[PDB]
Design a protein around this motif. Structure first.
Motif, PDB file in Angstrom:
ATOM      1  N   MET A  89       0.873  -1.194   0.000  1.00  0.00           N
ATOM      2  CA  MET A  89       0.000   0.000   0.000  1.00  0.00           C
ATOM      3  C   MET A  89       0.905   1.237   0.000  1.00  0.00           C
ATOM      4  SD  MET A  89      -1.547  -0.026   3.917  1.00  0.00           S
ATOM      5  CE  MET A  89      -1.865   1.728   3.852  1.00  0.00           C
ATOM      6  N   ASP A  90       0.282   2.370  -0.241  1.00  0.00           N
ATOM      7  CA  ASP A  90       0.929   3.701  -0.207  1.00  0.00           C
ATOM      8  C   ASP A  90       1.412   4.021   1.208  1.00  0.00           C
ATOM      9  OD1 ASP A  90       1.591   6.378  -0.536  1.00  0.00           O
ATOM     10  OD2 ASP A  90      -0.365   6.918  -1.480  1.00  0.00           O
ATOM     11  N   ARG A 143       4.763  -1.870  -3.373  1.00  0.00           N
ATOM     12  CA  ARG A 143       3.596  -1.694  -4.271  1.00  0.00           C
ATOM     13  C   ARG A 143       3.323  -2.960  -5.103  1.00  0.00           C
ATOM     14  NH1 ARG A 143       1.560   3.553  -3.945  1.00  0.00           N
ATOM     15  NH2 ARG A 143      -0.485   2.685  -4.488  1.00  0.00           N
ATOM     16  N   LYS A 174      -0.182   6.505   3.649  1.00  0.00           N
ATOM     17  CA  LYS A 174      -1.334   6.058   4.445  1.00  0.00           C
ATOM     18  C   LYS A 174      -0.864   5.147   5.597  1.00  0.00           C
ATOM     19  CE  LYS A 174      -4.405   5.541   0.226  1.00  0.00           C
ATOM     20  NZ  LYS A 174      -5.696   4.860  -0.135  1.00  0.00           N
TER      21      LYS A 174
HETATM   22 CL   LIG Z   1      -2.950   2.149  -1.167  1.00  0.00          CL
END
Ligand SMILES: [Cl-]
Ligand SMILES: [Cl-]
Ligand SMILES: [Cl-]
Length: 163
Positions: free
Chosen positions: A12-13, A147, A16
């Protein structure tokens, strides 16, 4: 310190994250850049005030009370394999010093020099092993952000292998 210091990986990013601080895969000039560095610039732009720092170093700048640790991995397009490997190890050692100094119980960290600074090579194992060498002696919970689905599986396997 964390009660039972751990490694985890999430796909995920990193903008965040659920950790007490973030490591930016920075450029030496403190520019918004792209990839992780551009997501970090959008989420924490105040942390780019006087964030410029040389290759192989880390410089922390606060966004409010949230620490952003700017870690400058070598661009393997410009460095030899040998000098690049030394600077990539050094950047992670400086991240461990900052995480310790800040007294955080958790840190979100990307794999330095694995994206546009990879010189077109797969550096998952090289970068992760340097991350372990630096962070193993710290007691923060480390959460690695990636990612790619196949990278998530390989990072998870490498963590699980040490138990
Ligand atoms: Cl994400
Ligand atoms: Cl990169
Ligand atoms: Cl990835």
């Amino acid at each position: 310190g964390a009660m039972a210091p751990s490694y985890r990986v999430k796909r995920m990013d990193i903008a965040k994250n659920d950790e007490e601080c973030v490591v930016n895969a920075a450029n030496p000039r403190g520019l918004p850049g792209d990839g992780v560095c551009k997501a970090v610039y959008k989420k924490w732009p105040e942390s780019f005030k006087n964030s410029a720092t040389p290759v192989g170093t880390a410089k922390t700048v606060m966004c409010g009370t949230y620490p952003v640790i700017h870690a400058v991995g070598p661009n393997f397009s410009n460095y030899t394999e040998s000098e690049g490997d030394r600077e990539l190890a050094a950047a992670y050692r400086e991240v461990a010093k900052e995480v310790t100094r800040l007294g955080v119980n958790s840190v979100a960290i990307p794999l330095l020099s694995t994206g546009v600074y990879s010189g077109g090579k797969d550096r998952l194992t090289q970068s992760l092993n340097h991350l372990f060498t630096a962070m193993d002696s710290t007691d923060a919970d480390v959460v690695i952000y990636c990612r790619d689905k196949e990278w998530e599986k390989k990072i998870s396997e490498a963590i699980q292998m040490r138990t």
